[PDB]
Symmetry: D2
Subunit: 330 residues, 4 copies
């Protein structure tokens, strides 16, 4: 099995942890964070979105004992002191959101780890990979990024559409679920004034680099897509609204056929397909990073269409982080 260490036991670190429990190829052996082992156990045990942890969690001697397995807990603010080698860590899931560059993440390799997977878009030229889009381009680099949740949703769909009909250009809008960075009531958000306004009372316009980032995982689409976001008061599921101009004329039925074929073929487990009258909550706990909603989309004509795809911002992304870890471990 692959031994993983999680740096940063936040929303993502915890979902990566919970998802890993259902996997036999990956095993989390250590967790690092500036929180008390007792507090971490509580946040693992109870979750307003994902429900109670299905298993046993006890704190003994400052460490966590999850389902019997002892998990080393530390509180190092500096990655270089993590001593991952003492616990035999192969890959480190970097989830603090603070070390998104090579020289910072590299510290884990200095601390004993062999490879690092950033659970967010790298801030430098560190390569990003998205399952269904470019895992095959992986060339053995020791530090890698899993891009973002929106890019993970957009990339697979954009690939199927482009491969079959050719995307001339497209604009995306993601109706985004409330994040941890937003506020409960009108408060300060210096770099993002709109973002500081009460999340529960508002539809908040926001900018996103997720659409442009698709160009990095799918070079052939570089410069052909961009978009924005609207932050809404929902808890977990977001939706991508992609308006595209096709090179090859295609009826909506042909578009549905192409997506469905991919969902049951080369992108099974990545891209999902549905024709049901679904709503956001129906995807809470969804592992597919992109679920094509056939009935929600609409076409003006054979070359201008609006496609809709759902994604659980935490569950889908987190499972793919594990997929990348497995992939880079050969």
């Amino acid at each position: 099995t692959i031994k993983v260490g999680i740096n940063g036991f936040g929303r993502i670190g915890r979902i990566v942890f919970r998802a890993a429990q259902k996997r036999s190829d990956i095993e989390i052996v250590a967790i690092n964070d500036l929180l008390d082992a007792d507090y971490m156990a509580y946040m693992l045990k109870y979750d307003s979105t994902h429900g109670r942890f299905d298993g046993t969690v006890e704190v003994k001697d400052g460490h966590l004992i999850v389902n019997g397995k002892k998990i080393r807990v530390t509180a190092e603010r500096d990655p270089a002191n993590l001593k991952w080698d003492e616990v035999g860590v192969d890959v480190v899931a970097e989830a603090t959101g603070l070390f998104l560059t090579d020289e910072t993440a590299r510290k884990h390799i200095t601390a004993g780890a062999k490879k690092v997977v950033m659970t967010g878009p790298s801030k430098d030229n560190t390569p990003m990979f998205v399952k269904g889009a470019n895992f095959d381009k992986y060339a053995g680099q020791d530090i890698v990024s899993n891009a973002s949740c929106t890019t993970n949703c957009l990339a697979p769909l954009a690939k199927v559409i482009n491969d079959n009909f050719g995307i001339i250009e497209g604009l995306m809008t993601t109706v985004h679920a409330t994040t941890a960075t937003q506020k409960t009531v009108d408060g300060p958000s210096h770099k993002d004034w709109r973002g500081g306004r009460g999340a529960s009372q508002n539809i908040i316009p926001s900018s996103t680099g997720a659409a442009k980032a698709v160009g990095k995982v799918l070079p052939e689409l570089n410069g052909k897509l961009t978009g924005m976001a609207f932050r809404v008061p929902t808890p977990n599921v977001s939706v991508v609204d992609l308006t595209v101009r096709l090179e090859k004329a295609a009826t909506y039925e042909q578009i549905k056929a192409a997506v469905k074929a991919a969902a049951e073929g080369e992108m099974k487990g990545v891209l999902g397909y549905t024709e049901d009258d679904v709503v956001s909550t129906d995807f809470n706990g969804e592992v597919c990073t992109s679920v094509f909603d056939a009935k929600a989309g609409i076409a003006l004509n054979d070359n201008f269409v609006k496609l809709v795809s759902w994604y659980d911002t935490e569950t889908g992304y987190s499972n793919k982080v594990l997929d990348l870890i497995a992939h880079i471990s050969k």
Copy 2:
């Protein structure tokens, strides 16, 4: 003053009433609904969205007495039995949502009213008029429709963009505020399954004819626009997300210049313009039916752009209903 009668004291009927109080040329003299005066007074007095009524409302002899003025309250299920003439009603604001056809609405004329304005889109060929779009095309018709709130937002913006740069094709998405048609919890909705899902926990994909309806008030745009909606857990303000392909190249700055010019000139009071970091709640109580958000929009290139415009589904629309009434009575 134009003496108006309101049929259907629901959400729209009530806001039309509150709005009319601030107009010296329009005067509400009668209301008809299947609710007792006491309950109607209560619903006028208190509103979770618009706040308390700015004035006095009392019940005497089963009739409302608002700000000292007596208002005849009736409970006729049949418009034909309304006797509008008895109280001198000139125009009837038809807001029950039940008589959106000439046949049904004409009963008000039989009952003594001179003209009728439907506060919703016509089901038959009754002409629809949208301020800033086609009020100039009015030709003496005694029964007219004010279209829907979404159409009132899209039409003015679409006209400005088309007149200046020419819209080849467009696809819209309205992130819609929760409607009274929605369920608080997963309940039966045979007409629209998704619509019966809990409104509070979901982002609900929905269909809309507002985009296509633009082709009716702006024939030159017939067949060039269509779209859908996403209903979200917010109270009053919605936003249109318009993705358009332009005939004539235009930089985003030039597009902004054009919109601002219209807002300050020809479409003053209908189309608004802002460059502030606004969010939905900033438009609660907004009179303009469409407020261009300069900083929220984004352009892929000089011919493919995404525009954003806000609108209070109740305040804007209701003020325009009053405008149409004044317009057809000139």
Copy 3:
């Protein structure tokens, strides 16, 4: 196995169904509602609160096929026409909320059923039974009621406190989750004006008979308890706030000791006990009808205390409906 038939496939009927799937002794063989099989299948398959159905649901010949088992679907507005005998129904879970009287409910007996359990409080003198409170008093009655969700939470707790310290008088408040009876936006509610106000933006004071209803299942407490409710913008979990005056002095520690003893003994499975820092969502899916929150309560002195107990309005109640069914069929 006890063969059960469900009349009314609404919220309660559906959860009773999901819950029954996990019971080897109870078996649902028929459902009756005025909805088509297709729609019912959809409502069973997807739920915004409870998630997707854990199993397979298919429609064949207008009948449901859940987990391979065929379930007879009918659409009778009249219980008398149900023919329960044809499918061998032993007990009928009456969940339409329309037949809460012996006269009306007895029609199921005429239709071939042996016994009937109302999933709501009786309107007449049909006896009500609450697990942990008076199941032992059952005396062969063929038509019984399971009371309401709030009563199921209050009764067990009230009994433990009374049996040990003696309740002289008590006043309760249930901070209630939003019900399907509520409006998403300010709409008509002649029966309860406050109840027609927008559920999403308000804290709505409401009346409840659950506290007084305790006097019926626990006669010794008749006339000693009453209370009210506050409906809030949350989905499933409610909480009772019970302020009581004790006959025998008791420290909060002694009260905790007593409650814990009952939860681990006589009331195991009905009354739960916790000392964790829980919040409402931690009880979504909770089977216990009352979960004592040890750290939330507070005592003024040894004779005046405020107790707090949580309850999932749907999961707890529905599991007990099944318990009553099994109990009256023993």
Copy 4:
């Protein structure tokens, strides 16, 4: 007029500012905060709860110009450097929530101010005052506190009830609106684990010292009251739920009479009275710190009753802060 300087332009500082615009006796001449004048102008201009500021706000030379009046803006992290004397400040409204003791608040007097009013409960023995309860006990001290919003709601009601029937003992529960200290999604809250859970999805039990604090403003009630709180997903209005044991027997009608008399007499403007079917939103913008809801309350008997009172956590409190400032200025 009294010249006031505000230290801390947060939620409270801003509402105190906006309320002061409607007062001719008080004039804000300076504001201090670690935010940019441009950012402060934006937060003053737009508010999701209170709507847009009714007036003009422009930033010139690093200062704010509100309705023409120039307001000195500074960004001193240390009160002693505020130089209040240069702007002629009489009283300082201390709203940062950081200087709740004599020695810290005293710095303003060192900086040139004459008196200080803490907009929160003092952490030391600094005297607290609540309008309607003990303003008359004010003995000319230079540093004073306005207690908290819940105490401001509870104190006046408790006084009327105690004065007329005598409170033997009582327990309170405040259904509290979402505060700035809560989180949007499950995050860290080291001193309050429950408080770190998602506010939008939960009913969160919480402890409060507001009930006990009543003993400080009303010594005669010292030790007779205590309580707790439930944090719910509403934006602005909270409600006090007081269960009391009366010394003198009183029917609910006699209780309503006593409260109404006080509301129209000695506590006019402080204590409000209503018999309408109101809900939380009906009190958004309420200046009365306590509004007795006659129809929501319930009595078990003539000596044990449950009273309900509403309060806008920001508007009511803020207006009383201004009242205290006026009061201490003779």
